[PDB]
């Protein structure tokens, strides 16, 4: 499924994220965007034989299990496929599990690289929160 801004930014709350580890909802929307573009059923291949899943892009390597990546250790305990469902339950649940371990929101390249450090705010302006 492919969330708009405002209606992810919703569900990324009425989830227990506005604020989860001290990061604001705005930071997940933005990591989310620029990560997947709002779109659940989106995949990507690193070289290392590894794959992102869901929409916000979790990594085969270390959290979930696609059953075709190696050095494996499947930290959240679900398919990768799980965490491409139009419900972002699973997605949410493995994320917060990432973001407490300790690198918090740099464990995502694009959050660092285009996220941090920018008004964040800006990607729940309009929304009814």
């Given at each position: 499924?492919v969330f708009?801004?405002?209606?992810?930014?919703?569900?990324?709350?009425?989830?227990?994220?506005?604020?989860?580890?001290?990061?604001?909802?705005?930071?997940?929307v933005?990591?989310?965007?620029?990560?997947?573009?709002?779109?659940?059923?989106?995949?990507?291949?690193?070289?290392?034989?590894?794959?992102?899943?869901?929409?916000?892009?979790?990594?085969?390597?270390?959290?979930?299990?696609?059953?075709?990546?190696?050095?494996?250790?499947?930290?959240?305990?679900?398919?990768?496929?799980?965490?491409?469902?139009?419900?972002?339950?699973?997605?949410?649940?493995?994320?917060?599990?990432?973001?407490?371990?300790?690198?918090?929101?740099?464990?995502?390249?694009?959050?660092?690289?285009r996220?941090?450090?920018?008004?964040?705010?800006?990607?729940?302006?309009?929304?009814?929160?």
């Open positions: 499924k708009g801004r405002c209606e992810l930014a919703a569900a990324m709350k009425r989830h227990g994220l506005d604020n989860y580890r001290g990061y604001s909802l705005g930071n997940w933005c990591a989310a965007k620029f990560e997947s573009n709002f779109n659940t059923q989106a995949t990507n291949r690193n070289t290392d034989g590894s794959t992102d899943y869901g929409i916000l892009q979790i990594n085969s390597r270390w959290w979930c299990n696609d059953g075709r990546t190696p050095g494996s250790r499947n930290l959240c305990n679900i398919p990768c496929s799980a965490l491409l469902s139009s419900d972002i339950t699973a997605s949410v649940n493995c994320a917060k599990k990432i973001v407490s371990d300790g690198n918090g929101m740099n464990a995502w390249v694009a959050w660092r690289n996220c941090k450090g920018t008004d964040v705010q800006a990607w729940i302006r309009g929304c009814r929160l």
